[PDB]
Symmetry: C2
Subunit: 405 residues, 2 copies
């Protein structure tokens, strides 16, 4: 940076602290990643200056010729990546992508069937303190109490009983492959639309490492910033038959001017995802998660569902008589970033929890491999088996530093 340090020492000092923090810590929050310098430059462009309400070739205002090229690049590359008939790259966030789909097909108080929030479903999939649960009547399906895999007979029974207008599949904390074919079959039986929120797994889908929901879902929502490794924002994919309605839901429905600089950054990230090296990256993400899972089990930890098919895992801390809150706190003390997370059938509140969620997308981006996964698991074992030993925590601290340099 050249201008910010002189203009705003306070903001610059804090940004620099954050930059150094991202390098020093072992980042295991499953939803996080590190974007390229190209993506950041796009976000830092003059495109922030342009009001571009509407869509390419059909904008509210003149002078959109070049931002139109940018948005079309984003849309066409998204279609290349996921094989969708239509893309909307304007949603400001995952929240707004989901909001727009709900706005398109639901009326106030309609019934929606989503994944149990304490079993892996997201806040925007029906929390009573979120617009989703306030505006619509959400009911939930669960995972099997033993396998922690989605119970598709429960999905079916809930759908048949409650007759939802919309079924939502996908999750913030589900470590296994989701069967979209079965979701669509159930949706078809009850005459419901199917929406898949692939936010967490979008990069894996792009890389052919998780089944693609696009062929099975009426609507696919996602963030651009998780496994897709793009800027912070949202996106909607859908079949051509819903394109007009979806676009109208985003604008003039729920948003105004799009963030054209972020959309440029989306295009850049989609360009990166189309490359061969992104596919290799994504395989390492999944390979690393499986290795980390196995290594954690070797340390004596129990994992939700007994492992992982994707980028993330959930440690069930009950065997160690620890809460997720306690684990999160002590790992923070040694420079490992995780989050407490409810496990299925958790006896604790979502503010305490019996689990920690871990993902490998960020550490894989930094170049960590199988050997580093082994060491991360060993450090976690050292910490969680010795929460009362300052010497153990200091050793962990040093081993974390050794990994990040």
């Amino acid at each position: 940076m050249k201008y910010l340090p002189q203009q705003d020492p306070q903001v610059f000092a804090a940004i620099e602290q954050e930059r150094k923090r991202q390098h020093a810590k072992i980042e295991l929050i499953a939803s996080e990643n590190f974007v390229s310098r190209a993506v950041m430059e796009a976000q830092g462009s003059v495109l922030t200056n342009k009001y571009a309400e509407g869509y390419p070739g059909r904008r509210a205002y003149g002078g959109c010729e070049y931002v139109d090229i940018v948005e079309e690049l984003a849309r066409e590359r998204a279609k290349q990546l996921f094989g969708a008939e239509h893309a909307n790259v304007q949603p400001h966030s995952g929240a707004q992508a989901n909001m727009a789909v709900y706005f398109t097909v639901l009326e106030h108080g309609d019934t929606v069937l989503g994944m149990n929030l304490s079993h892996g479903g997201h806040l925007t999939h029906g929390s009573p303190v979120n617009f989703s649960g306030v505006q619509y009547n959400f009911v939930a399906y669960g995972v099997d109490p033993e396998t922690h895999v989605i119970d598709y007979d429960d999905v079916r029974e809930k759908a048949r009983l409650h007759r939802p207008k919309l079924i939502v599949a996908a999750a913030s904390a589900y470590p296994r492959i989701i069967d979209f074919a079965k979701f669509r079959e159930i949706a078809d039986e009850v005459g419901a639309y199917l929406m898949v929120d692939m936010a967490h797994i979008a990069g894996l889908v792009a890389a052919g490492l998780h089944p693609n929901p696009v062929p099975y879902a009426h609507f696919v929502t996602t963030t651009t910033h998780k496994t897709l490794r793009g800027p912070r924002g949202g996106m909607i994919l859908c079949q051509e038959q819903f394109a007009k309605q979806i676009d109208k839901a985003i604008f003039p429905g729920i948003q105004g001017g799009p963030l054209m600089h972020v959309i440029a950054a989306k295009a850049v990230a989609f360009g990166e995802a189309l490359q061969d090296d992104f596919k290799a990256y994504a395989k390492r993400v999944v390979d690393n998660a499986k290795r980390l899972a196995s290594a954690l089990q070797n340390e004596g930890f129990t994992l939700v569902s007994g492992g992982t098919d994707n980028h993330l895992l959930l440690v069930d801390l009950r065997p160690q008589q620890l809460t997720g809150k306690t684990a999160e706190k002590v790992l923070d003390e040694v420079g490992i970033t995780v989050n407490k997370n409810t496990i299925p059938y958790d006896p604790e509140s979502p503010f305490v929890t019996s689990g920690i969620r871990i993902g490998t997308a960020a550490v894989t981006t930094r170049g960590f491999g199988l050997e580093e996964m082994d060491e991360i698991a060993a450090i976690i074992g050292l910490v969680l088996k010795n929460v009362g030993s300052e010497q153990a925590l200091e050793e962990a601290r040093q081993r974390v530093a050794a990994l990040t340099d």
Copy 2:
């Protein structure tokens, strides 16, 4: 830029076209401006990598120590600028800021009283194709048919008849000072909350050039990107009594993770707005608008309300027998960017209109003064009085180029 040109030639080429476009054209879209290099650098920072759901010191996840400093800088500087008891700097946009306030105080189907959309009110103030008009029962107050000033007796009568839960004041195309004291008096009479959407005028308010709604309103919403000359985004100001509810409305209510890089950029822009030179800038904006208005009248144009108190003006094109659409198109041909805009009691559709909206914020940022206002008005006269003369349009083209270099 260093990395984007190599990584993504297509995106870079389009960005460069847009950058050159912003320099070449005379930008008179009233909602637009040019941000500083410092603001852009903040947006282009690694802060995009951080999930920071929640609020400073009360986040969902760990590691937020430094983004907390950034968000608090934004909040405290906003409070300095506007004298508000509370700030929420997380809204992704003006749309989401408004959405959050509505979510806080209204139930589905509640009555809201806003400014007539064809008289200057915004899409989010009750359009039937916007969430506002779909989710809530909007009624409208109008301006006087002769003066085009808000009819406060009409505000009062509509409020007393319809008994709205909320009254919205503020506008996207109102060229005169809004009387917030009178709005609050009317709100008090009917027991309604008052929300002021100061998006357009926020920079002028910060500079003491428009009365501050903060002392009179329960809630003040704004964008950060218009006269405030900040990054693209939203903000809510409110009294302490609503702080908890407002914060909950943004998260977990209507949004998820905030855009921490944009919030950094907000802090930077608020820092700039606190400086003496921003106050001088804002005075030039208003001085320039008044000069441009006067100069347009000298050319024989009729202005809505007969002039301006702020950054913007509306030309009533009926005397010239032109539509706003026709005017917008021909001005585009010569390199002047305006938008067609409905005038009060417009005989035309919002897709055709009898007016053009013009603002001086952007040209003032580029250093234009009174002499340039005279010339802009003269070029507009030349064009609109000679729409069928290619020689006239070519002269205009050359005079526009002379202004931008």
